[PDB]
Amino acid sequence: KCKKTTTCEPLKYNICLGSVLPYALTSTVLAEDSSSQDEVHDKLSLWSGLRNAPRCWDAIRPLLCAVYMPKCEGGKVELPSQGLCQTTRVPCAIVARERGWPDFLKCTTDYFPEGCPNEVQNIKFNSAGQCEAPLVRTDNPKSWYEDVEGCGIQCQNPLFTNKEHREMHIYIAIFSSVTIFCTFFTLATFLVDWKNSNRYPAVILFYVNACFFAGSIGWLAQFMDGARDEIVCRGDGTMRLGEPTSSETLSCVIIFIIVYYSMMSGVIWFVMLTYAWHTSFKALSGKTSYFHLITWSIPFVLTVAILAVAQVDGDSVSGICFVGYKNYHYRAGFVLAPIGLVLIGGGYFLIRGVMTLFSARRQLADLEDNWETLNDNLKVIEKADNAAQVKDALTKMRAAALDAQKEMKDFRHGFDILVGQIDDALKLANEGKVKEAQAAAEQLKTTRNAYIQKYLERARSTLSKINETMLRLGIFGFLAFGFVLITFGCHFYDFFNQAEWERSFREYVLCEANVAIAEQTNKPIPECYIKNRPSLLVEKINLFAMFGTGISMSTWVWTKATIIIWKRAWCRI
Ligand SMILES: CC1=C2C[C@H]3[C@@H](CC=C4C[C@@H](O)CC[C@@]43C)[C@@H]2CC[C@]12O[C@@H]1C[C@H](C)CN[C@H]1[C@H]2C
Ligand SMILES: CC1=C2C[C@H]3[C@@H](CC=C4C[C@@H](O)CC[C@@]43C)[C@@H]2CC[C@]12O[C@@H]1C[C@H](C)CN[C@H]1[C@H]2C
Numbered sequence: 054k055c056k057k058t059t060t061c062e063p064l065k066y067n068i069c070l071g072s073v074l075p076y077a078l079t080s081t082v083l084a085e086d087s088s089s090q091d092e093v094h095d096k097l098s099l100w101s102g103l104r105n106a107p108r109c110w111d112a113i114r115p116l117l118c119a120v121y122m123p124k125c126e127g128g129k130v131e132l133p134s135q136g137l138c139q140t141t142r143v144p145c146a147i148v149a150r151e152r153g154w155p156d157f158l159k160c161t162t163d164y165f166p167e168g169c170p171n172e173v174q175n176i177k178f179n180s181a182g183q184c185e186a187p188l189v190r191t192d193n194p195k196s197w198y199e200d201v202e203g204c205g206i207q208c209q210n211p212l213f214t215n216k217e218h219r220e221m222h223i224y225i226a227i228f229s230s231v232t233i234f235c236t237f238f239t240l241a242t243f244l245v246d247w248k249n250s251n252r253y254p255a256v257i258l259f260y261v262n263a264c265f266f267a268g269s270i271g272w273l274a275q276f277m278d279g280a281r282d283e284i285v286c287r288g289d290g291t292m293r294l295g296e297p298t299s300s301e302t303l304s305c306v307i308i309f310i311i312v313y314y315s316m317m318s319g320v321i322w323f324v325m326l327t328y329a330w331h332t333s334f335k336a337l338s339g340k341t342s343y344f345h346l347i348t349w350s351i352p353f354v355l356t357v358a359i360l361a362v363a364q365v366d367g368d369s370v371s372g373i374c375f376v377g378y379k380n381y382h383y384r385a386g387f388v389l390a391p392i393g394l395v396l397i398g399g400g401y402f403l404i405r406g407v408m409t410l411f412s413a414r415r416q417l418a419d420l421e422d423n424w425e426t427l428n429d430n431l432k433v434i435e436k437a438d439n440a441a442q443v444k445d446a447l448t449k450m451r452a453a454a455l456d457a458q459k460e461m462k463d464f465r466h467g468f469d470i471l472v473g474q475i476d477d478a479l480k481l482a483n484e485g486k487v488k489e490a491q492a493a494a495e496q497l498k499t500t501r502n503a504y505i506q507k508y509l510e511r512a513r514s515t516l517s518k519i520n521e522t523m524l525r526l527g528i529f530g531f532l533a534f535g536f537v538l539i540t541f542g543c544h545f546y547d548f549f550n551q552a553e554w555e556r557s558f559r560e561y562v563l564c565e566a567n568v569a570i571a572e573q574t575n576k577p578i579p580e581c582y583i584k585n586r587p588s589l590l591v592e593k594i595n596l597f598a599m600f601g602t603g604i605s606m607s608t609w610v611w612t613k614a615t616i617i618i619w620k621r622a623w624c625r626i
Contacts, residue, residue, distance in 0.1 A: 055169035057082065057132055061125035065090040069118040070097065071202030072178050073185075073566035076124040083130065084121045085157040093121050109145040111178070116141045119173040120158065134169040135162055175570050180204055185569040187211035187562065191289035195298060198562075206294075208286035209369045212558065212586045221370050222276075224593065228600040229272040235607035236266035242610045246618055253341050254329030257322055258609055260348070264319030265603040271311030275372030284308050284374060285367040293367035294379055297360060309365045309374040310356055313387075316599075317352035320395045323533070327402035330526075334409040351391075359387055370592070381551045389544055396537045403530050410523060417516050419456075424509055426453035427501060434494045440487040447482055447490070450497070451475045467504030474500055536602050543595040547587060557584040 061078040068074065079090070087093045100117055104110050119133035138160040148154060157164055177183045180203030184190035188198060191205035198206040209218070243250040243259040250256070275281040283304045287293050297306045325344045332340075359365065359376050366378035377384030430446040430453070437443060454475060458468035474496055482490035564581035571578035 055131055055134075055166055056129040058128055059125070059130055061128060061130075062090075064122065066094060066122075067563050067566075068200050069122045070101075070114050070178070071200060072114075072118070072176055072180075072183065073201060073204075073563065073569075074118075074122060075176065075567045075570040076126065076172065077563075077567075078125040079122050080125040080130045083123055083132065083157065086155060087121070097121055103145075103148070106147065109147055112140050112144045113148075114178045115171075115173045115176065116158070118176070119171050124172045131171060132169060133165050133173070134171050135160060135165045135167040137171055137174065138165040172570075175574050178202070182573075183569065185565045187565070189290055191287075191291055193287075193289050196287055196289050196291040205289060205291035208282065208290050208292045208367075210292075212554070212583065213370055213589065217589055218370060221589065221592065222372065225272065225371065225596060226276065228596060229269045232265065232600050232603040232607070233269040233273060235604050236262040236269065239607040239610040240266060242615055242618070245622055249618075253338060254326055254333065257326045257329060257344075258606065261319055261322045261326070261606050262610075264315045264322065265606065266315075268312050268315035268319065269600075269603065271308050271315070272373065274308055274311075280304075281369070281372050285369045285372065292369070293365070293374060295363055296365035296367070296374060297363055305367055305374040306360065306365055309359075309376070312373055312375060313359070314352045314356050317355055317391055318348050319603075320392060321348045321351055324395055324398040324402070327399040327406065331402045331406040331409060334406050355387055355391065359383075371596075381548055384544065385548055389541065392537060392540070396534065399533065400530070403526065407523065407526055410519065410526075414519055414523065417512055417519070420509070420512060421516065423453045423457035424505075426450070431494060431498060431501075434491060437491070438487075440482060440485050440490070443482040443487060443490045443494075444479070447475060447479045447494075451479065464508050467500075467508075470504055471497065471500055532605060533602070536598050540595055540598045543591050543598070546591055550585070550587070554586060557586070560584065 059080045059082040061080060064074060064077060064079050067077075081087050081089060081093055084093055084096065087096055097117065100113075103113065116133060116137060119131075119137060123130050123133070138158075142149075142160060180190055184204040187207045188201075188204045189207045190203055191197070192203065193205070196205035198204055209215075213221075239262040240259065243256065250259075275284055283302070285293060285305070287301060293301070293305050296309070297303065325348055329344070362383070364376055364380060364383045365374050366376075367374045368378060375384075376387050427450055430450045433446045434443050434450075437446075451472060454468055454471050458465055458472065474493070478490045478493040478497065481493055561581055561583050564579070568578055568581055570576070
């Protein structure tokens with residue numbers, strides 16, 4: 054009979070000599086020189102050396118597959134046919150001459166029964182129609198998926214359909230457009246007033262938006278008539294992976310360089326921003342030429358390193374080329390690490406900045422507290438009947454003014470005068486003279502205005518400036534940290550389940566490989582699908598995060614003080 058009784062075990066390799074196996078279970082019983090599938094793969098590695106003789110190889114492939122890796126299903130293995138074995142004798146006669154034939158490969162009808170249907174005869178090792186979606190026939194051996202011959206891994210992302218591609222593309226369209234013109238607004242502002250806006254750290258924002266403009270450009274590049282497929286796909290319609298490979302158009306690596314470099318410089322400029330703020334608070338342009346070198350060296354070195362390991366991959370959904378898609382331990386290395394370090398540094402100099410801020414914020418408030426005391430005490434003194442209230446309030450005034458006394462010598466002199474006059478009024482009030490002290494408090498009023506009000510209203514305005522700065526730092530801090538937290542979350546999710554998505558994808562590929570033969574042989578065909586895939590909402594979130602940062606830094610230039618600056622250049626008469 055065409056069937057043999059043995060125990061079916063799973064394939065350790067789902068490929069037979071560059072051809073995908075349409076079945077899932079096999080048996081090592083027919084390979085009489087083998088006992089395990091390791092041995093089988095070894096023997097096939099020995100038979101591999103025959104590939105230098107294509108004339109024989111063509112005819113011996115199917116036999117070798119039907120023998121060493123046969124279909125096992127429900128305790129049965131189908132034995133190869135006599136007709137199949139006879140097609141090996143004539144051309145592979147070389148095997149017979151140099152070392153002879155193995156006894157289990159000799160065409161004795163007990164090993165090869167006559168007229169037996171074989172699953173292998175259906176399989177084509179010249180992949181004319183063998184290549185099955187999500188795979189496409191390419192005859193370039195640099196695009197061949199794993200060990201499969203003639204088949205390449207298709208260009209468009211096989212985890213999301215076109216219905217989702219259009220979606221994400223219009224999403225990225227809108228967002229990146231908002232960013233590309235917001236950053237242009239912010240550039241134009243600091244550019245038209247290049248003479249008056251070129252200061253540090255106000256030019257650091259300009260540099261940030263410059264970077265995030267350059268990047269959004271590369272993000273928009275994929276929307277031209279046929280540019281997307283030029284960036285993402287190879288010449289043979291198979292997605293660009295491990296770029297830059299030899300003899301491929303640099304239409305990918307250029308976009309990668311843009312999107313990555315602009316991004317990284319764009320986030321190191323954050324650290325430079327926080328430092329510049331801190332040192333601005335601590336009091337200059339001595340280190341202003343050294344920030345540059347850092348913010349341009351580090352992204353360069355990183356990008357060059359990525360190009361050195363050649364781990365640029367192409368995504369059709371995003372429509373760009375970026376680091377560490379295929380191998381996700383590179384994305385964590387070149388994206389998550391620099392961003393995290395940026396978060397740490399920028400956060401450090403932020404809190405240092407608000408310490409440098411907090412220390413004065415209390416001082417000015419204390420001065421305001423003393424002035425708050427003086428006025429209300431004068432309010433009580435000027436309008437009182439009992440001469441105990443006058444004594445009391447005068448003492449309190451003395452305490453406050455004394456506490457406030459603790460170009461500068463003039464300021465202290467004023468409070469000398471105030472304390473003195475207050476003590477005079479104290480002497481007057483102690484003796485029970487109510488209205489004499491009350492009248493001697495108007496002296497305190499006019500003196501308060503004359504000698505003290507200057508330095509006070511001088512330091513009255515700063516509490517608005519300082520609080521505004523404090524709250525805008527309150528914006529930037531809890532904004533940037535939120536963005537970093539979110540993008541770290543997304544990247545960590547993908548980082549987490551990319552170990553599973555590849556499993557599911559592979560199983561799916563094998564399934565469709567089964568479907569291929571299952572259809573053109575009038576055999577029952579099983580439905581194939583992806584068990585699990587990346588969430589599109591997560592990618593939505595990440596994009597929203599980075600573009601949201603790109604927009605929020607362009608929002609900074611949005612002031613009413615800016616709007617009028619535009620008029621000066623061309624208002625004329
Ligand atoms: C590759 C090769 C062969 C390896 C095959 C053998 C047929 C049977 C088996 C049994 C199986 O258990 C292990 C594999 C082995 C040995 C076949 C004969 C032809 C050739 O050996 C020649 C040696 C010669 C020096 C050069 N040319 C070499 C090749 C054409
Ligand atoms: C398709 C695919 C992927 C699409 C995913 C990517 C992780 C991150 C993103 C970013 C996100 O914005 C869009 C989706 C995208 C591009 C993931 C990497 C693994 C894989 O590429 C592998 C090639 C490999 C040879 C076989 N296995 C293939 C697939 C598991």
